[PDB]
């Protein structure tokens, strides 16, 4: 499926700053290749993808009352659509 | 390293001095490499001299 591959959008000062530049930041399945992300985003949003950049974030160690543990490892994809392509909303 | 016919092989026991000091040793079987055909086809296998005594292939 395509909606298994794209988990959720990423809303931050950084992600929101590059929306105008037609770059959409998604949290994607940790197993998903940037090729799978390209074709998933095209299926879901009906856009035309120019490039996908991807980066792995390792889990962040957190403490809560003498119990310590790691947040989830994330895979973040930045999807640049074409000039002619329609925008994604958020 | 074992007789294919019988199962003769190394077994442990004692070497004893006069004065009866004991130390571990083995008794090896008198295994000889020979061509026989247990299976239809011939093959080089360990066989004890004792097993060869009397009737065998060779």
């Amino acid at each position: 499926d395509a909606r298994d591959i794209i988990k959720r959008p990423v809303v931050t000062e950084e992600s929101t700053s590059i929306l105008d530049d037609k770059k959409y930041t998604f949290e994607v399945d940790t197993r998903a290749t940037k090729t799978q992300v390209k074709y998933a985003v095209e299926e879901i949003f009906d856009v035309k993808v120019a490039k996908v950049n991807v980066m792995n974030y390792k889990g962040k160690l957190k403490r809560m009352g003498r119990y310590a543990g790691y947040t989830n490892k994330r895979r973040k994809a930045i999807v640049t659509v074409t000039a002619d392509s329609k925008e994604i909303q958020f | 390293k074992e007789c294919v016919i019988t199962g003769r092989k190394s077994r442990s026991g004692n070497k004893r001095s006069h004065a009866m000091n004991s130390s571990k040793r083995t008794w090896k079987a008198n295994l000889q490499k020979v061509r026989i055909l247990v299976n239809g086809k011939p093959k080089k296998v360990w066989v004890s001299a004792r097993a060869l005594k009397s009737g065998k292939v060779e």
Partner: protein, 59 residues
């Protein structure tokens, strides 16, 4: 659940797709902080599971 069994396999398969599209939109709205009724998410997940259970029973 019994209403799902009234449907054909192909019809159920179409309902799954519809629910997966819905679930994706919920997760998308949740992320952007626009959901409110957050209990819908669990409902839809269960529904999808229910669909796939019925279909596996058919075979």
């Amino acid at each position: 659940a019994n209403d799902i069994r009234d449907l054909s396999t192909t019809e159920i398969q179409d309902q799954e797709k519809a629910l997966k599209e819905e679930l994706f939109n919920l997760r998308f709205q949740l992320a952007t902080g626009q959901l409110e009724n957050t209990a819908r998410i669990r409902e839809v997940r269960k529904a999808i599971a229910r669909m796939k259970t019925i279909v596996r029973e058919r075979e």
